[PDB]
Write a protein that holds these residues in place. Structure first.
Motif, PDB file in Angstrom:
ATOM      1  N   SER A 148      30.680  48.254  39.591  1.00  0.00           N
ATOM      2  CA  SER A 148      30.433  49.288  38.585  1.00  0.00           C
ATOM      3  C   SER A 148      28.948  49.609  38.453  1.00  0.00           C
ATOM      4  N   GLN A 149      28.085  48.612  38.695  1.00  0.00           N
ATOM      5  CA  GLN A 149      26.627  48.763  38.820  1.00  0.00           C
ATOM      6  C   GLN A 149      25.993  49.300  37.535  1.00  0.00           C
ATOM      7  N   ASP A 150      26.575  48.944  36.391  1.00  0.00           N
ATOM      8  CA  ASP A 150      25.995  49.414  35.141  1.00  0.00           C
ATOM      9  C   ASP A 150      25.963  48.310  34.092  1.00  0.00           C
ATOM     10  N   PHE A 151      26.550  47.167  34.418  1.00  0.00           N
ATOM     11  CA  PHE A 151      26.483  46.050  33.506  1.00  0.00           C
ATOM     12  C   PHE A 151      25.107  45.407  33.560  1.00  0.00           C
ATOM     13  N   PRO A 152      24.598  44.922  32.420  1.00  0.00           N
ATOM     14  CA  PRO A 152      23.442  43.999  32.415  1.00  0.00           C
ATOM     15  C   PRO A 152      23.814  42.548  32.721  1.00  0.00           C
ATOM     16  N   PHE A 153      24.958  42.357  33.399  1.00  0.00           N
ATOM     17  CA  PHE A 153      25.386  41.057  33.918  1.00  0.00           C
ATOM     18  C   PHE A 153      25.222  40.946  35.424  1.00  0.00           C
ATOM     19  N   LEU A 154      24.995  42.070  36.071  1.00  0.00           N
ATOM     20  CA  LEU A 154      24.886  42.050  37.527  1.00  0.00           C
ATOM     21  C   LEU A 154      23.477  42.276  38.041  1.00  0.00           C
ATOM     22  N   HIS A 155      23.225  41.842  39.293  1.00  0.00           N
ATOM     23  CA  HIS A 155      21.878  42.075  39.781  1.00  0.00           C
ATOM     24  C   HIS A 155      21.768  42.252  41.277  1.00  0.00           C
ATOM     25  N   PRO A 156      20.680  42.840  41.833  1.00  0.00           N
ATOM     26  CA  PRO A 156      20.486  42.863  43.310  1.00  0.00           C
ATOM     27  C   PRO A 156      20.737  41.564  44.061  1.00  0.00           C
ATOM     28  N   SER A 157      20.508  40.447  43.388  1.00  0.00           N
ATOM     29  CA  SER A 157      20.815  39.128  43.915  1.00  0.00           C
ATOM     30  C   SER A 157      22.308  38.949  44.159  1.00  0.00           C
ATOM     31  N   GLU A 158      23.156  39.299  43.184  1.00  0.00           N
ATOM     32  CA  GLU A 158      24.587  39.070  43.402  1.00  0.00           C
ATOM     33  C   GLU A 158      25.317  40.300  43.951  1.00  0.00           C
ATOM     34  N   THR A 159      24.712  41.486  43.790  1.00  0.00           N
ATOM     35  CA  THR A 159      25.316  42.765  44.177  1.00  0.00           C
ATOM     36  C   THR A 159      25.641  42.816  45.655  1.00  0.00           C
ATOM     37  N   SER A 160      24.686  42.381  46.468  1.00  0.00           N
ATOM     38  CA  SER A 160      24.824  42.430  47.913  1.00  0.00           C
ATOM     39  C   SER A 160      25.976  41.555  48.394  1.00  0.00           C
ATOM     40  N   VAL A 161      26.138  40.373  47.780  1.00  0.00           N
ATOM     41  CA  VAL A 161      27.287  39.510  48.056  1.00  0.00           C
ATOM     42  C   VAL A 161      28.585  40.220  47.698  1.00  0.00           C
ATOM     43  N   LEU A 162      28.596  40.913  46.553  1.00  0.00           N
ATOM     44  CA  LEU A 162      29.800  41.628  46.132  1.00  0.00           C
ATOM     45  C   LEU A 162      30.147  42.777  47.075  1.00  0.00           C
ATOM     46  N   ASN A 163      29.138  43.481  47.588  1.00  0.00           N
ATOM     47  CA  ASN A 163      29.379  44.571  48.536  1.00  0.00           C
ATOM     48  C   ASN A 163      29.932  44.043  49.856  1.00  0.00           C
ATOM     49  N   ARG A 164      29.344  42.941  50.345  1.00  0.00           N
ATOM     50  CA  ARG A 164      29.806  42.303  51.577  1.00  0.00           C
ATOM     51  C   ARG A 164      31.251  41.841  51.456  1.00  0.00           C
ATOM     52  N   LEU A 165      31.616  41.289  50.296  1.00  0.00           N
ATOM     53  CA  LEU A 165      33.013  40.941  50.059  1.00  0.00           C
ATOM     54  C   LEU A 165      33.890  42.182  49.925  1.00  0.00           C
ATOM     55  N   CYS A 166      33.341  43.279  49.388  1.00  0.00           N
ATOM     56  CA  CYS A 166      34.140  44.475  49.122  1.00  0.00           C
ATOM     57  C   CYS A 166      34.557  45.202  50.389  1.00  0.00           C
ATOM     58  N   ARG A 167      33.796  45.022  51.480  1.00  0.00           N
ATOM     59  CA  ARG A 167      34.166  45.623  52.770  1.00  0.00           C
ATOM     60  C   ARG A 167      35.583  45.236  53.205  1.00  0.00           C
ATOM     61  N   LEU A 168      35.889  43.934  53.157  1.00  0.00           N
ATOM     62  CA  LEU A 168      37.192  43.428  53.578  1.00  0.00           C
ATOM     63  C   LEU A 168      38.311  43.945  52.686  1.00  0.00           C
ATOM     64  N   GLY A 169      38.056  44.035  51.380  1.00  0.00           N
ATOM     65  CA  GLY A 169      39.086  44.498  50.466  1.00  0.00           C
ATOM     66  C   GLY A 169      39.377  45.979  50.596  1.00  0.00           C
ATOM     67  N   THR A 170      38.336  46.787  50.840  1.00  0.00           N
ATOM     68  CA  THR A 170      38.537  48.211  51.106  1.00  0.00           C
ATOM     69  C   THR A 170      39.380  48.426  52.356  1.00  0.00           C
ATOM     70  N   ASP A 171      39.045  47.697  53.433  1.00  0.00           N
ATOM     71  CA  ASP A 171      39.854  47.762  54.647  1.00  0.00           C
ATOM     72  C   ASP A 171      41.279  47.292  54.399  1.00  0.00           C
ATOM     73  N   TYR A 172      41.461  46.286  53.538  1.00  0.00           N
ATOM     74  CA  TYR A 172      42.797  45.773  53.256  1.00  0.00           C
ATOM     75  C   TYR A 172      43.646  46.781  52.489  1.00  0.00           C
ATOM     76  N   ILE A 173      43.035  47.493  51.533  1.00  0.00           N
ATOM     77  CA  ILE A 173      43.737  48.555  50.813  1.00  0.00           C
ATOM     78  C   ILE A 173      44.180  49.645  51.777  1.00  0.00           C
ATOM     79  N   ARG A 174      43.288  50.037  52.697  1.00  0.00           N
ATOM     80  CA  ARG A 174      43.637  51.049  53.696  1.00  0.00           C
ATOM     81  C   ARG A 174      44.761  50.576  54.613  1.00  0.00           C
ATOM     82  N   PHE A 175      44.726  49.293  54.997  1.00  0.00           N
ATOM     83  CA  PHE A 175      45.747  48.721  55.873  1.00  0.00           C
ATOM     84  C   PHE A 175      47.111  48.744  55.208  1.00  0.00           C
ATOM     85  N   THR A 176      47.195  48.199  53.990  1.00  0.00           N
ATOM     86  CA  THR A 176      48.463  48.139  53.267  1.00  0.00           C
ATOM     87  C   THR A 176      48.983  49.532  52.939  1.00  0.00           C
ATOM     88  N   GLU A 177      48.070  50.464  52.660  1.00  0.00           N
ATOM     89  CA  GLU A 177      48.443  51.836  52.344  1.00  0.00           C
ATOM     90  C   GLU A 177      49.065  52.534  53.552  1.00  0.00           C
TER      91      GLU A 177
END
Lengths: 162, 129, 185, 179
Positions: C28-57
């Motif tokens: 969401s990139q608007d919380f004051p709970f997230l940061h460039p430190s953890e964001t990049s890890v979340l994006n790297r994890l999000c690649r696989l999930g986006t592909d998985y949604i496309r696969f199942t769809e």
């Protein structure tokens, strides 16, 4: 010591609830207050799984008569069993005689699908039921697209099915 | 789950009433042997229900297991109950309800779950004829 | 954060990981709970999930949506449905990984993002490679036996996990050709 | 109250947020060398004019370094200013007076650029040569076990005291293999 004070990335069963409550309230403000989903969890995990196990029987439960993102998770795992209901509803008969025979041939698969539930899950996680009943619910779902729930009978059904 | 196991009680009361009411001579010689070959199936249902109680006493019986056990005995009692209702209501007796059992063998034959019961019941009822 | 990400990656969109078709999952990139430190890890994890949604769809769209009927191999047809059927079975360890992850969070709720990135590193290369292999098949309306060649040429690569992974689906599609050939000869 | 109390107690937030902080402690030379040196300098009338700093402690910097060396890029500290990752200047720890600190984190940032480039090389395969494909595969095989070592040290910030001299000598046989 006092500690290095665990981050929100680390602690995840109390700060998880805090974040869940907070984003729920934020979304409710961003609409206005006409959304209204309390409780980041509730009832439990096992209760909802047993509820869904009863959904696959094709009858009533405690959340259907047959975060807040649980409903998106719940719909595909309830809709497996609402597809089981439409094949038992296509079945009473033991005019047309071969239609009675075909309808009774459906039940020999329906009893397998009814036996797989309450033998393979004795209550597992809900995501497990979502993964397990995709490779199982699909085979049942093809036949619900097939059946009417009118339907042909006589030579018309004997030739359509061939 | 209680609601789907309950029809076997309704299709047991009918069978036990047909055996007492139709054993006298105003219903004739064939109805005696017919109720007599119904009587063994009443005893058979009782033999099933006692073993399930003996299992229930150690806390080992569940309602799901009860459903699975009574599914073979539901069909038999259902055929018996429907037939007994029809024979008493139209006051059919003698050989006019030895034609009816020969017809009931044909009536549901698509999976042939009901033919094999009714052929047995016909042979037993036609033994004194 | 904990069950929410597993919810999003399974194929049901999250409210923090908002499903788009042009940016996939995005935090969401608007919380004051997230940061460039953890964001990049979340994006790297999000690649696989986006592909998985496309696969199942794609698999859901093309498996069990008709009585196999006219039908073309770019939309309908036995070969494409066979591709979806094999694609679900190669994706089974990803499901097992998510199920295992929730159990570990139950055992201890204090695990970090480094643990999930560390376990999911082995999928991290495997999903992007097979994604374009299925993407070229979808876009060009490849019909008939050319589908087998299209996945076949990129299973002549220089990456072992992609080779085994694509070879399984190709076996599945051979199966439907062989089942039809076993009568006609 | 509700969420802010949980923040204020259990979670740090003092370098990530541009929110300045002061920490109360017993101080007494063994851990107050920075403030003592600052007072020495101020008494000599430099003329004050200090840098803007937001006061981060020592143990936060450890987790940021372990993140950088695992292979995840673009963090709050060790952010690129020329393409090369470089440590932030809002840092004062209550001892060492940030002159040993800027040198040690500077060498570690010089290490971080080398693995930053290699993870970038693997990144550009996510978006026919066949030897590059077999090259990033072995690079990847180093990276998974290496990242495991980094993440294990990250766990031991959650469950005993960790300091700089522990992480440097523990990562000695990896800084050999990086060259």
């Amino acid at each position: 010591g006092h500690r290095e004070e665990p981050y929100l990335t680390e602690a995840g069963r109390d700060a998880f609830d805090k974040f869940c409550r907070l984003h729920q309230g934020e979304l409710q403000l961003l609409a206005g207050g006409v959304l209204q989903a309390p409780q980041p969890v509730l009832v439990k995990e096992c209760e909802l799984v047993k509820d869904v196990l009863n959904v696959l029987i094709g009858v009533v439960s405690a959340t259907f008569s047959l975060p807040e993102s649980i409903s998106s998770l719940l719909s595909e795992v309830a809709e497996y069993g609402t597809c089981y209901t439409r094949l038992s509803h296509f079945s009473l008969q033991p005019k047309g005689l071969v239609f009675q025979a075909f309808t009774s041939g459906l039940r020999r698969y329906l009893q397998y699908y009814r036996a797989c539930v309450l033998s393979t899950p004795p209550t597992l996680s809900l995501l497990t039921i979502g993964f397990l009943f995709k490779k199982l619910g699909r085979q049942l779902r093809y036949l619900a697209e097939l059946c009417g729930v009118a339907f042909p009978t006589g030579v018309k059904l004997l030739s359509y099915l061939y | 789950l209680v609601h789907r196991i309950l029809p076997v009680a309704a299709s047991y009361s009918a069978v036990t009433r047909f055996i007492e009411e139709k054993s006298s001579f105003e219903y004739g010689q064939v109805n005696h042997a017919l109720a007599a070959a119904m009587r063994t199936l009443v005893k058979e249902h009782l033999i099933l229900v006692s073993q399930l109680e003996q299992l229930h006493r150690q806390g080992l019986l569940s309602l799901q297991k009860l459903w699975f056990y009574i599914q073979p005995a539901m069909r038999t009692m259902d055929i018996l109950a429907s037939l007994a209702t029809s024979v008493d209501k139209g006051e059919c007796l003698g050989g006019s309800t030895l034609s009816l059992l020969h017809d009931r063998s044909f009536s549901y034959t698509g999976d042939s779950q009901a033919q094999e019961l009714c052929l047995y019941l016909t042979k037993a009822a036609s033994a004194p004829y | 954060m904990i069950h929410e990400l597993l919810l999003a990656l399974s194929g049901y969109p999250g409210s923090i990981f908002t499903w788009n078709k042009r940016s996939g999952l995005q935090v969401s990139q608007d919380f004051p709970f997230l940061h460039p430190s953890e964001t990049s890890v979340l994006n790297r994890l999000c690649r696989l999930g986006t592909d998985y949604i496309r696969f199942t769809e794609f698999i859901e769209q093309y498996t069990g949506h008709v009585q196999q009927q006219q039908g073309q191999g770019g939309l309908h047809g036995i070969y494409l449905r066979a591709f979806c059927t094999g694609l679900d079975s190669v994706l089974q360890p990803y499901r097992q990984a998510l199920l295992d992850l929730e159990q570990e969070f139950l055992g201890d709720p204090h695990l970090s993002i480094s643990h999930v990135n560390y376990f999911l590193d082995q999928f991290q290369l495997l999903f992007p490679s097979v994604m374009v292999v299925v993407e070229q098949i979808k876009s060009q309306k490849i019909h008939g036996c050319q589908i087998l060649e299209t996945v076949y040429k990129h299973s002549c690569g220089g990456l072992p996990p992609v080779r085994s992974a694509l070879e399984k689906i190709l076996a599945v599609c051979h199966g439907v050709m062989y089942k039809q050939l076993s009568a006609w000869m | 109250p509700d969420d802010r109390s949980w923040l204020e107690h259990h979670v740090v937030h003092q370098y990530w947020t541009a929110r300045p902080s002061q920490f109360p402690h017993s101080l007494h030379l063994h851990s107050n060398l920075a403030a003592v040196w600052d007072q020495h300098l101020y008494s000599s009338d430099p003329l004050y004019v200090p840098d803007d700093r937001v006061l981060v402690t020592e143990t936060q910097v450890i987790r940021e370094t372990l993140w950088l060396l695992s292979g995840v890029k673009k963090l709050f500290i060790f952010q690129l200013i020329d393409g090369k990752v470089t440590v932030r200047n809002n840092i004062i720890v209550t001892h060492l007076t940030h002159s040993c600190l800027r040198s040690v984190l500077e060498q570690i940032a010089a290490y971080g650029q080398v693995v930053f480039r290699l993870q970038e090389f693997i990144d550009e395969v996510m978006g026919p040569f066949r030897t590059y494909q077999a090259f990033m595969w072995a690079l990847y095989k180093y990276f998974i076990s290496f990242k495991e070592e980094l993440a294990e040290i990250e766990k031991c910030i959650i469950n005993t005291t960790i300091t700089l001299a522990i992480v440097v000598d523990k990562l000695a046989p990896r800084l050999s293999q990086l060259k």
